[PDB]
């Protein structure tokens with residue numbers, strides 16, 4: 340897989356590696372799930388999420 | 398903002414209001430607890446640098462509800478390539494004197510990695526621009542925070558569809574050419590924010606245009622992806638005496 344197509348399947352950030360290797364990464368205040376693509380908050384107020392709306396659909 | 402709507406209180410929690418001697422100067426974007434991104438041109442006429450205030454958690458300017466947090470601006474960092482009175486490299490990085498406290502009403506916008514921003518975010522058509530700027534060209538500024546969804550144009554297509562500064566690689570166009578919807582005076586420095594898979598990211602800064610909502614013209618926005626590494630390096634740097642810092646770019 341490649342980062343320039345479909346974000347490499349990553350929810351957030353994507354690095355291409357020597358070989359057919361891709362690594363997804365997450366912003367500070369998030370951790371990468373075992374699927375290797377998804378990012379989940381590790382703190383109360385992660386960047387780029389709107390608490391009153393996250394609470395609205397939680 | 399022209400032709401938008403009120404941003405419901407708390408739904409634009411990264412929005413910053415910049416004040417000089419208590420008067421409205423500009424907008425800005427919170428990107429973590431101490432750092433705010435704005436527009437270089439906001440500071441072209443500053444005389445006393447020690448009178449700059451940033452306010453987070455702001456919504457209705459006519460009242461205090463207690464969610465507001467004010468901080469002195471300790472540093473203003475502007476790239477060496479910016480020339481006052483002109484439009485290219487229209488970006489400024491502000492250090493707050495004390496961190497803000499993250500709350501339901503005060504949340505940073507994610508500063509994306511460059512590659513992600515160039516390869517993915519740049520192709521998200523619509524993004525949100527916000528501010529307490531003028532509601533109409535030659536009109537009064539907003540008392541409640543306004544927000545506007547604007548489509549991004551490829552620069553070739555902006556130049557083709559527009560009808561005088563250049564559109565450089567450090568800029569992009571977004572909005573409408575029919576005079577209905579635009580960012581306006583007072584909105585300068587504020588966020589152009591882009592949603593991708595559940596999270597919002599900083600892609601632009603309210604920069605300039607041919608007046609406000611001028612028919613045949615689009616809003617011009619600083620292309621933040623060109624500045625990610627520059628910003629990241631400065632955020633790791635020790636503070637320097639004196640508010641203004643001109644820092645080399647690239």
Ligand SMILES: [NH3+]CC1CCCCC1
Nearest residue numbers: 580581582605606616
């Ligand atoms: N978008 C057009 C406006 C022009 C005045 C400064 C903010 C941007």
Ligand SMILES: [Ca+2]
Nearest residue numbers: 456457460461
């Ligand atoms: Ca208020």
Ligand SMILES: [Cl-]
Nearest residue numbers: 446447448469
């Ligand atoms: Cl002082």
Ligand SMILES: [Cl-]
Nearest residue numbers: 633634635636
């Ligand atoms: Cl240093």
Ligand SMILES: [Cl-]
Nearest residue numbers: 637638639640
């Ligand atoms: Cl000092």
Ligand SMILES: [Cl-]
Nearest residue numbers: 446639640641
């Ligand atoms: Cl000073």
